[PDB]
Symmetry: D2
Subunit: 308 residues, 4 copies
């Protein structure tokens, strides 16, 4: 279980730490333009190993991805507060290509996990750039928000989060949405739970989603950047892949008809194991919610068209 | 987190051991009419603690339930061939009564976790005999079979069990049933799953439910008794209660209108915590499954009324 | 990580349950003369799997040990004399080792049958396997409990409590008080600094630890949860290649001045058996204790074959 | 189990993250000059909670230390003169400890800021708290990394590797090689039976552990994951009342021949602070090392005031 991390910034670095404290993977190679930073990170991270399970951590080069089972791409230049997102995508595409090409050439044949924002778009870019099978290229999608969303519903309703089933689908970002109609707690629909427990106000639920959806913006405002949350979810996804888990997570997967969408990566439940996506789940959507999914995909699709 | 286990037999003993190895509970008082066995089981289990989290395990008497947080009743009389299931209830009631009363006398005011068979019947009995609130008396119901049911579906569809939602409800036993219409994988129904994945055959799925439900029978015929599965299920429930989790489990809960049922304990998904049942989930059912529920519940009510009637009048 | 369990009695059964709950090994083949019991036991156990990590459990035959990584021998019937107990278990041991060896099994042997030290020496001779591929539970259990009790009494996390009970597991085993320490401080020195701790308490403690099994048997009819858990830990150290230090039954090639017999002492064990046998410096008295324990054992070993 | 972290820099921030992933404590209030950063940090960390055990994390003020069970001080700037660094951190410390004590805090102090030993003594002086209710990370991390390295070299599970790096955390800390042992066998004795392990590789290993922090700072700019992880483990020993043995910064009352200074030495810590200061048997040279580190420490500690 060898992982090659690409991007030793706030997200990549925190991600490796999470992997270390949580005991996921056996070998982690850190790659970043700035070599010295990663060498230091490797030594520092390694000094924490005596408190967790063993691991081998080192500053690596794209060539070291040859026998890697999972490549995590975090390195993604942030949008300047005064530029087209298209530019953000045009600058990250160059950053991206300079990463995928050299990684492919190493002989790497494992799973790609894209976390760089905008993720859905960059997952399509990675796929197109690598020429890898659709199921071997994945994006963090809306797994982090779905997790938080479930956790918040759980706290409000007071039921163990493990029994709260809800999904946030679409392009991870401003257009993502909650599948309220299908969301349920232990088998009972949120709708039925409210009818049965009026104290759980419908308006508060709605704001909660909004708070989950806008949180990354808020954090960047206060702290300047977001990383702990994304880093933890990135680790979980990494765990499901490496441990051939067959877990169901809302990832950025390749659309081929599901929800009627085609030729794009967007967020939807999916089964993921050591060989990438096994299944792409189509959750019964309300026609209204199908519009949501529709809007979200068209906006994302246009940008994808232009960029290329 | 103090636990008082009544019945140090195969189930009871296995349960304690599970609690020990899994690190659930801080204290475990073992109670059984046979004192020396509980004393040796206490010492024996304590030699395992160095390989797990600490715990205080000792031989106990009902009076020790005074400050307990949980009382686990596994003490039950086996059904020998040739006796009405009515007799099996009659003698188990006598037993239950010899346990409930003294525990209630100690001042115990925690939660009751009934595991004896028939569990639903013995749960309602414990509830009635103790006088405890309906939500402070729970049966292990169909939690084990549901957990085993899910893992098997998981293995067949090859999807992590955590994302496999399926319930087996009704009276734990020969007439419990799987709510196939509502069961789903990560949000996608079993029916829909079979449509997209034809390799997943329906006869195998239904046979698997039968193999699950009949598993206890086969275990007894080959080995004489069953304890590892239920013991492990019991410890999970115990953890849900003691750690105040608000976990959803198909347990034996008091029916007060749900499923059109009233005044009996029967299996159905419920939310449980340190104060007992918090919520009873009403999973949408098919007219038939609903009928199954009604039937499973009528026969249930019949045996209670018979057992309690005989016990109310003939006891001396 | 495939394990073959020979003996589905109270110990074997508990052992597997421990393995199931603790998540050790991915496959357990249970082997016992009573097929039905092993069959129902495998089904009961498997129902416990949804609450733990996955594993494959089934009623096996010695031949299933062909591709097994670990073979644990618990078999053996519990008013008997020990000499005539040893004899009926050497015979049983033979009926197990031979066929397991013929299946091609080139893994590790972990003997738990009693007397362990004697029967462990028997497995070695009966299988031919290298002195380091045949291991006995030794005194790992008693030491684990001995350390735990010192920790409670002393009120310091047991992980830092270092003590060993060595020699033949049983009546003649003894504690190495001289080398035993807390955080690195000898027990002796700890007692000086803290008089609240009494030698009478410490001395009776070892005794209680040592004769515990005797009482559990008297009270409950048999002991199994303790050794089961200890076997499970040993099983883990082997299957996961931990190179852990445990007082196991190891072959004597000079240590403590002993030779050609298995006996209890700290050793490093991993996926490939015992990696190292550790010699703890002993006190003259302690050397005697070890000496006396070994001679008493060696005689019984000598007359057995 | 509530905690008040003072300092939301790379170390405190990472500390909080570790605490969150490892699920230690149920409440963490992050206190730092820059509020918005501690505010956006708490939101960010709270988004990770769904993947771990529950916790209540928030931006706090010194006043929130009132009911706190433990306060962790990581504030303190990272050219520089050993003297100047101490003198300005002593100032920072004063602007923190005072206000925290004013809140009503009657819990434990865990000092992580460097130079840790000196800043720990300062915390004791400034807080007026009991000697046992003021703790410094001391050499716990280096000792932990030191043991792990010896284990990888000797190929024996680290839990069985007992070694101690003592003295003032810094350039003057030294390894107690004489007492260091593996499963009860001495490093010196271990080497004898294992030629391939050379005292040359062993001395260089320690030196790497000691000056590693320095290499990390040059390469990356700062060091935080090692210290943060270690802080979280000490925090766990305290919040869970473990009575764990860790080389911490503790008040010397004659032990080792030292008096009236905090310095690195094995100790038992729990919910109520330091239970015991362990005095490990030092060689003449190892004893000289302790004196040298302490006298030099004492010097810098005096001038500082």
């Amino acid at each position: 279980q060898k992982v090659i991390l690409v991007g030793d910034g706030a997200v990549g670095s925190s991600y490796a730490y999470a992997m270390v404290l949580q005991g996921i993977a056996q070998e982690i190679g850190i790659v970043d333009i700035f070599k010295d930073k990663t060498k230091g990170d490797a030594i520092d991270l390694s000094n924490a190993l005596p408190f967790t399970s063993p691991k081998k951590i080192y500053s690596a080069e794209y060539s070291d991805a040859k026998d890697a089972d999972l490549v995590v791409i975090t390195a993604g230049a942030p949008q300047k507060p005064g530029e087209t997102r298209l530019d953000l995508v045009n600058k990250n595409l160059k950053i991206l290509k300079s990463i995928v090409d050299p990684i492919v050439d190493s002989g790497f044949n494992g799973i790609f996990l894209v976390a760089a924002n905008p993720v859905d778009i960059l997952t399509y870019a990675t796929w197109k750039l690598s020429g890898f099978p659709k199921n071997r290229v994945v994006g963090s999608g809306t797994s982090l928000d779905t997790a938080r969303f479930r956790q918040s519903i759980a706290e409000m309703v007071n039921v163990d989060a493990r029994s709260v089933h809800a999904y946030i689908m679409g392009e991870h970002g401003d257009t993502e949405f909650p599948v309220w109609s299908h969301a349920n707690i232990g088998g009972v629909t949120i709708a039925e739970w409210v009818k049965a427990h009026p104290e759980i106000k419908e308006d508060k639920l709605v704001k909660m989603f909004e708070d989950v959806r806008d949180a990354a913006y808020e954090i960047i405002k206060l702290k300047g950047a977001t990383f702990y949350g994304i880093a933890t979810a990135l680790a979980r996804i990494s765990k499901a892949i490496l441990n051939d888990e067959n877990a169901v997570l809302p990832l950025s997967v390749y659309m081929d008809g599901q929800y009627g969408l085609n030729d794009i990566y967007i967020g939807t439940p999916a089964v993921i194991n050591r060989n990438g996506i096994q299944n792409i789940l189509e959750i019964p959507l309300t026609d209204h919610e199908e519009e949501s999914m529709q809007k979200s995909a068209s906006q994302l699709k246009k940008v994808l068209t232009d960029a290329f």
